[PDB]
Amino acid sequence: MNLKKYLSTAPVVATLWLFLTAGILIELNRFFPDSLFY
Amino acid sequence: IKKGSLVKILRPESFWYNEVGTVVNVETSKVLYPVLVRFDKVNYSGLNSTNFSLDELVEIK
Amino acid sequence: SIVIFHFSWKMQSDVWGTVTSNGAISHITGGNFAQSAITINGWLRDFLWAQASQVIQSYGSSLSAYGLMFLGAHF
Amino acid sequence: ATKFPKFSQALASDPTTRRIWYGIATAHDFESHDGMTEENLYQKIFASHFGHLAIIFLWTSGNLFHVAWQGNFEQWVANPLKTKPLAHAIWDPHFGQAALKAFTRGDTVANISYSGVYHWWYTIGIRNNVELYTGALGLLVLSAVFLLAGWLHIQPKFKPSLSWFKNNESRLNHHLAGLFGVSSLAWTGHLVHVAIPASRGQHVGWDNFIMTPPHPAGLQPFFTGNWSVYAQSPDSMQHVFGTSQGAGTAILTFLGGFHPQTQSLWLTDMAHHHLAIAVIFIVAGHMYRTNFGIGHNLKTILEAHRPPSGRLGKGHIGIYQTLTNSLHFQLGLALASLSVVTSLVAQHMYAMPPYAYMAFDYVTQSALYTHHQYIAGLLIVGAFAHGAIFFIRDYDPEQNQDNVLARMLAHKEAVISHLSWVSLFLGFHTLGLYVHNDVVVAFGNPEKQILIEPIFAQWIQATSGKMLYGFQVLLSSSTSNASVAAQQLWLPGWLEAVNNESNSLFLTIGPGDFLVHHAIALGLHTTTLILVKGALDARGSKLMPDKKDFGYSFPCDGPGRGGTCDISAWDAFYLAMFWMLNTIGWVTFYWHWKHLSLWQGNVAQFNESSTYLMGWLRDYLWLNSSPLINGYNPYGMNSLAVWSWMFLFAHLVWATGFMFLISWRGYWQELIETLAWAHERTPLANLIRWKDKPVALSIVQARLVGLVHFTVGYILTYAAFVIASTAGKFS
Amino acid sequence: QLAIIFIWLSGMYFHGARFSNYVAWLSNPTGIKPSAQVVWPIVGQQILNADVGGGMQGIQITSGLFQLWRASGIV
Amino acid sequence: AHTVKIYDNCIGCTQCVRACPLDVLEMVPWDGCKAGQMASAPRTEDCVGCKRCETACPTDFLSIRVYLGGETTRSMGLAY
Amino acid sequence: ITDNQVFVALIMALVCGYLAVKLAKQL
Amino acid sequence: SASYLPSILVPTVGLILPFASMAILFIAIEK
Amino acid sequence: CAETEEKYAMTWSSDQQHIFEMPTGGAAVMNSGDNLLYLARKEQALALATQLRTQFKIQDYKIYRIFPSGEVQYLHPKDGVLPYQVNKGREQVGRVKSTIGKNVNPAQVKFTSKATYDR
Amino acid sequence: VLTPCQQSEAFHKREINEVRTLENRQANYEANSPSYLALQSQIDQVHKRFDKYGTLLCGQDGLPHLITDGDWRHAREFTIPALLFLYITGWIGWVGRSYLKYTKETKNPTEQEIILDVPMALKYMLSGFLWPLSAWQEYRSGQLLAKEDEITVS
Ligand code: CLA
Ligand code: CLA
Ligand code: CLA
Ligand code: CLA
Ligand code: CLA
Ligand SMILES: CC1=C(/C=C/C(C)=C/C=C/C(C)=C/C=C/C=C(C)/C=C/C=C(C)/C=C/C2=C(C)CCCC2(C)C)C(C)(C)CCC1
Ligand code: SF4
User: Fold this and answer.
1) Which InterPro entries match (chain G) (predicted)?
2) What is the domain count for chain B?
3) How many domains does chain I contain in total?
4) Which of A23, A26, D267, D672 is the most exposed place for a label (fewest CB within 10 A)?
5) 3-class DSSP string for D373-420
6) Does J48 touch chain E (CB under 8 A)?
7) Which string of b and e fits D683-716 if b means at least 16 CB within 10 Å?
8) E strand or H helix that includes residue D33
9) Is residue F69 within 8 angstroms of chain B, CB to CB?
10) Mutate to test the interface with D, among I4, I43, I110 (most CBs of D within 10 A)
11) Angstrom distance (rounded) from CA D491 to CA D484
12) The domain that contains I19 carries what CATH number?
């Protein structure tokens, strides 16, 4: 019930956002590696 | 002036200088700093609760 | 730091290395401790300048992550 | 007065050893003594300036004396490229035998002089040791003259009035005309009469200069404006310096460029140069009014510069008061201008090397640069530090009622926010790009690097004619306005110096220029973030706005209100010394690794391996400390054992700094008590009891002495490495 | 704390299981350099996968797990 | 001596005297505040200057401001 | 390179030293 | 070139001058 | 030492033989009836006053400051009552009229032997 | 001089040297090793790496340099990810400013910053998409800025 409040705190959502954008960078650098254009 | 009024400061060594604040207590017994004003934010002493004179009592409307 | 700088340089001079034909001896620095640990220029030169050379030339190879965790640890 | 500090009784009362250290470190703070009034200050600094200039000329007479007496100067004049120039001799009773054979350059065992002084004395035209003795005596005389004035203007009949020091109105008229114009015009009186003929073979001493004119016809038919006669026969191409052969006889030709052979500026160019600068400075000396009254009143010159736009305060009303009646504003501008002059001088001693057979000794050119750069950064940091001393102990915001300085203290939050912004932009975009290039190069790939061409410096070299880029603009394009506008005067002699690659004028450029120059602008904006921070929050911060009351370099405010380690305006100096040594560090590391790539020849070694950090630490520090760190072996030694011993020495200095910077006082204040118990309680030595009580150093002093060992260790380490490195790859 | 240590040793036994060349290391230990961790192939860092022998590459162990497994008898 | 000055912000909450471990500070009845109190520093010859007062001074900004002045034997706090 | 000029120099900086200590105990 | 003068002047400035200067300065704490 | 420095001898009484801690260190015997206690400096002594007073009742206590001429002094209290408590005998010294905000700028104090707050 | 990179000599020298150098490890394995297939994929990722840097400018170093003038022939080099980036942290900055001017007027602004209200957070995360003409129209109302905030003595 109050677990979703813990999953709304600063460090946990910091990991669930920097983990996510980290996965945006890595999954966007497996599909299109060596991307110096554009 | 009165309690609960939202008051800007004009004293340069107030930490909340040019920041509004709420009035908690006013004494009318010639205390030189009677108007106790506390704030939302917090100085370096950890303490929002301070007090001031009447020249540094500028309200808003 | 000077315990392991005693360890990893006395035992690269007095213990470790290979052996060749007829049981002959070969250390890694080649006995280069007692003529060189006595000073600091021998210590810094002959240890920290010379043993760094395999960390520093490590680019383009599998040892280059230590070439990154070397500079970043200086950072 | 009666104690150690014979000047302030607030320290003589202290029975500890504080009276010694603060008695030393406040000996020159003349503004804060016991009873030293306003006139008594200026009458002391006017004498101590004479003592100081006496120390300068005792120093230069020292160099004249050792080169005159122990150097191989005229033996060096015989062979300037071959012979390594000697400094003073050695008398070590510690050299047993094997070091004595590591110095023999002639009969003396003297040090190789890495200071460029023979080159300057050889362009002056001293070709003797005798002229150096007459010069050394000629500056013992001058040092004795300035000491005699320092005794003279402290005798009470001759101690001048304070209004004479407030004759600011006329010091500029006398300095710019006399000290600059007359000394520079007289310096053409040395170049034309000595440096022109003694470089053209003609040894003209003091005996025959009043008979032999530098031009074969001169000054009776030459108030007519026929001045092309003086610049008529230039020394064109086929000349070796010093000799009379292959040389013309013109005086003030402005060729431009270098010698073809010695890679130095023409002395005709310098004679015309200081002659022009002489005339323009004499014109500048006729500026302000005096007792005659034809010029400019300085009160009218500042107050009239008030914009009707109204944005820039109530103009400069007050600034003339707070430069005369203040001093640290005047000293701040003095160290500011001198500091920009020193950095400019270092940015031209390598760039346009003035002296014959420099850019041929590759160590003295690398010693002068790093010399004037560390002196340059020191003097900027001093200009800002007396900025903060000006805002604390010298600033009056009532004569500066909403003035330009009061406007500066007003909006200082924007200034510190934006120095913090541009510093935060560069430090994520040199370290961003260097850690990018270092990661990427580390993974077997120099190609995936971010390399940005520094197009703007390449374009400016195209505006000065470096045709190796393909821009073809104002001077790189031969058909432009300016390229034709001096086609005969000084251009074609100078584009030989530009478009050449061996010379050190407008260097060839890769992306190491880009990345490093962002790191240098990072160093400047950080260091001015510290200095403008602790020079505008020097007066008052929102942590403690009482900072004007505690003076300049008070220790702290105690643990109250969160903790207050280093709030004072002395943290601007304190931290900006570390950033100063960092920044001048990066400047001279960058310059030194540029010219070690030119002089060795492999500039491709630089441009391919300087955009990532293991390019620096690998290709420069690890490789170029190889002749340094081999300075003495268990096999033996050579001449660089002094520089390697100084190298390890200065690592020890640089690390004894950290004992004071990191580990602060109260550890030692509760440990000196243990030592004092150990001496009070021991027998046979408790008789020998102290007089000044043993007390650990206060933290104004602690961070200072950690700073001093940090600088001494830093600068002695890098002066060890420049000279041992370039002396090891050459000579 | 012991839960994190059992997650740690279970990690070392699984990186020994799926990712290591320990089975091939058990054949000739003096020739094959010990490696467990096999770096994922993103930009460049696949070059950290050192060809240490055993037919399969990856970054080289220095923790000495294979010696404790040969001592403990893990086949 | 380390000159202690106690300004007219001193509303007499007495965390200063209770916070000073040297008794340089005492409270003086002063009819200008609500508590009628205002602190005094008569015995500044024993004042260390450790600023333990200024930590526990809950005024607006530091009614009691310690200025670091002279350095005697007692004011330096040396044991011997 | 000679001998007596060195003595002339040390005499002149001995005089300069006396002017330095003459400046010393007055300021 | 008087090749004997550093044998006199180097020690008398290097060691014995920071003896008498320690006496003049250190007693000049009390003078 | 005691022949040249101000020894601080703290005199006090108690009721029961408790055990306190020295500022030199360790546990002390704490004579129950009446006990004096030589020390080295004042912060040790009033730190011991905080050591005992905040625990329990140790009143009728004060250090007699043995200055090396031979005689004593008396400071805590002087009027017999605890310092943060208010007595009507103490004369306040060490004030100014307002905050730091009206203190004088030190360029108005420069070349004068004044303070940055006296005005 | 920045040669076009597809024809520069030292560029293709790095092509031969890195394909061959990385290829030297590829002969250490059999025709169906997983590592051998991995170095097949890596050799592919080197030839693609050097063909996709064709329109750059590698000078005498053989390393592809960049140009930041906005020449519009180097727009895919610098200015297109420049405007792209400024859009992305203008997004991030307008999200953070908009969320702080949310939690500035709530019940307890302290507890708002530990525990992010993911309802209102993910409101502002997505709503801050068009920050030039939303931040600009909140600038024209005189509301992006402020006046008479905190300052020291002068
Ligand atoms: C025309 C008359 C005249 C002249 C020649 C001087 C000369 C001097 N005055 Mg002076 N003064 C004068 C009139 C004059 N004054 C009057 C009328 C007043 C009263 C109103 C004063 C009041 C006064 C005060 C109060 C002070 C002086 C001081 C000084 C000395 C300056 C310090 C110094 O060495 O800087 C010399 C600087 C240079 C020679 C040039 C430096 C800057 C250039 C641009 C850079 C270097 C040039 C070049 C590139 C490098 C060559 C070096 C070589 C290695 C290649 C200098 C000797 C100061 C002093 O020392 O007191 C004793 C001082 O404190 N004066
Ligand atoms: C022309 C240059 C110049 C002049 C006249 C002054 C003048 C002054 N400065 Mg100063 N300053 C300067 C440049 C200058 N500065 C520069 C360039 C910097 C930046 C480095 C500073 C940084 C600075 C600070 C931080 C302070 C001053 C202060 C002062 C004032 C008192 C000085 C004092 O008491 O020192 C007394 C003399 C000494 C302490 C002796 C100096 C010894 C230093 C600390 C170390 C040198 C030892 C050496 C390295 C060891 C040799 C060993 C070898 C192996 C290297 C005085 C007005 C002080 C002030 O006004 O407030 C009190 C002050 O706090 N200055
Ligand atoms: C390696 C040493 C080092 C480094 C990197 C810095 C860096 C910096 N100092 Mg600095 N400083 C140093 C030593 C150093 N200092 C020393 C020895 C002193 C003397 C004490 C000072 C004194 C000093 C002062 C007085 C000031 C600075 C300031 C700054 C900042 C300048 C603005 C900027 O460039 O930001 C760019 C940012 C960086 C360079 C940070 C590095 C990038 C990091 C590593 C990446 C982020 C984390 C990364 C993802 C890894 C995550 C870790 C992991 C656990 C998850 C910058 C952070 C100033 C400041 O605050 O400016 C705003 C300032 O006023 N410094
Ligand atoms: C700055 C000047 C200076 C000078 C001139 C010397 C000179 C000397 N040192 Mg020395 N030293 C110095 C600084 C100096 N030191 C410093 C700063 C340190 C600390 C780092 C040391 C540490 C040091 C050590 C540890 C040793 C020396 C030794 C020596 C002697 C070298 C032995 C030799 O082969 O000579 C030939 C020597 C002689 C012929 C004997 C001469 C001895 C003295 C000078 C003559 C007799 C003295 C006399 C009775 C007393 C009169 C007053 C006196 C002050 C002159 C020599 C006399 C060695 C020594 O002890 O020598 C025996 C030695 O072991 N030094
Ligand atoms: C709410 C988000 C936010 C916004 C809009 C800004 C905006 C600004 N900051 Mg910044 N800052 C932030 C967060 C933010 N900051 C945080 C969290 C920190 C602590 C690391 C800093 C530390 C910081 C420093 C030290 C400095 C600035 C400065 C500045 C100004 C110049 C731009 C710049 O370089 O930024 C700087 C950007 C960074 C240092 C990194 C970005 C910070 C984080 C990683 C991104 C923020 C996103 C935020 C956490 C999202 C939360 C809300 C969302 C969950 C709903 C600009 C007004 C500078 C200034 O005064 O210039 C005038 C300056 O010197 N900031
Ligand atoms: C704190 C303070 C301060 C500070 C200090 C300093 C340090 C300053 C700064 C200053 C500086 C440090 C300076 C700089 C300068 C700048 C400049 C100088 C810039 C500009 C540029 C220019 C000028 C150039 C250009 C050009 C060219 C390139 C060529 C052509 C022409 C021309 C010339 C235009 C003061 C005292 C003020 C005040 C008080 C306080
Ligand atoms: S100065 Fe030190 S001792 Fe004197 S009151 Fe403030 S804190 Fe207590």
Assistant:
1) PSI_PsaM, PSI_PsaM_sf
2) 1
3) 1
4) A23
5) HHHHHHHHHHHHHHHHHHHHHCCCCCCCCCCHHHHHHHCHHHHHHHHH
6) no
7) eeeeeeeeeebebbbbbbbbbbbbbebbbbbbbb
8) none
9) no
10) I110
11) 9
12) 3.30.1470.10
Contacts 24+ apart (CB under 8 A), I111-115: I111/D31, I111/D37, I111/D38, I111/D41, I113/D34, I113/D35, I115/F3, I115/F67
Show which residues on chain F lie within 8 Å of chain I, measured between beta carbons.
3-9, 14, 17-18, 21-23, 25-30, 36-44, 46, 48, 60-62, 65, 67, 73-74, 77-80
Q: Tell me if D353 sits within 8 A of D265, measured CB to CB.
A: yes
Method: cryo-EM
Whether D335 contacts D545, CB under 8 Å: no
Please tell me the distance from the alpha carbon of residue F40 to that of residue F10, in angstroms, as a whole number. Answer: 10
Cα gap D131→D121, rounded to integer Å: 10
Q: Which domain holds residue F38?
A: 1-80
Binding residues of C: 74
The phi and psi torsions of D384 (rounded to 5 degrees) equal -75, -35
SS3 J21: helix
Strands D451-452 and J64-66: parallel
In terms of CA atoms, which chain D residue is nearest residue H4? D91
How many other C-beta atoms lie within 10 A of the C-beta of residue D84?
16
Q: What are phi and psi of I7, to 5 degrees?
A: -65, 145
Tokens of G22: 């003459």
Taking the C-alpha atoms of residue D449 and residue D510, their distance in angstroms, rounded to an integer, is 13
Helix (H) or strand (E) holding D186: helix D183-190
D60: alpha, beta or left? (left if phi > 0; alpha if psi -120 to 50) = alpha
- Show the 3-state SS of D87-137: CCCCCCCCCCCCCHHHCCCCCCCCCECCCCHHHHHHHHCCCCCHHHHHHHH
Closest CA to D687 of I1, H24, H23, I5: I1
For chain F, the domain total comes to 1
- Class of the domain covering J1-154: mainly alpha
Tokens of I76: 């805590």
- Measured between its terminal Cα atoms, the distance across chain C in Å is 18
Would you state the torsion angle of the CA atoms of residues D236, D242, D248, D253, taken in this order, to the nearest 10 degrees?
A: 70
Q: Residue B11: give its domain's CATH number.
A: 2.30.30.50
The range of the structural domain enclosing residue B29 comes to 1-61
CA–CA separation, D579 and D140 (whole Å): 39
According to CATH, the superfamily of the domain at D1-731 is Photosystem I PsaA/PsaB (1.20.1130.10)
What percent helix, strand, coil does chain F show, rounded to 5? 15, 20, 65
Residue E35: how many other CB atoms lie within 10 Å: 26
Q: What CATH number does the domain containing F48 carry?
A: 3.30.70.20
Identity of residue D114:
Y
Decide if D106 contacts D72 (C-beta within 8 A).
yes
| Amino acid identity, position J120 | M
Residue of chain A whose Cα is closest to the Cα of D445: A34
Q: Specify the residue for token string 């580990």.
A: D663
Other C-beta atoms lying within 10 Å of the C-beta of residue D110:
20
Residue with CA closest to ligand 1 atom 25: D165
Q: What is the DSSP letter of D525?
A: H
Domain positions in chain D are 1-731
For residues F76 and F73, give the distance between their C-alpha atoms in angstroms, rounded to a whole number.
5
Q: Count the Cβ atoms, other than its own, within 10 Å of residue I105.
A: 16
Q: What are phi and psi of J4, to 5 degrees?
A: -60, 135
Q: Name all contacts of G4-13 with Cβ < 8 Å and 24+ positions apart.
A: G5/D133, G5/D137, G6/D69, G6/H2, G6/H5, G8/D137, G9/D65, G9/D133, G9/D136, G9/D137, G9/D140, G12/D137, G12/D140, G12/D141, G12/D144, G13/D58, G13/D61, G13/D140
DSSP B36: E
Does residue I77 have a cis peptide bond before it, meaning omega lies within 30 degrees of 0? yes
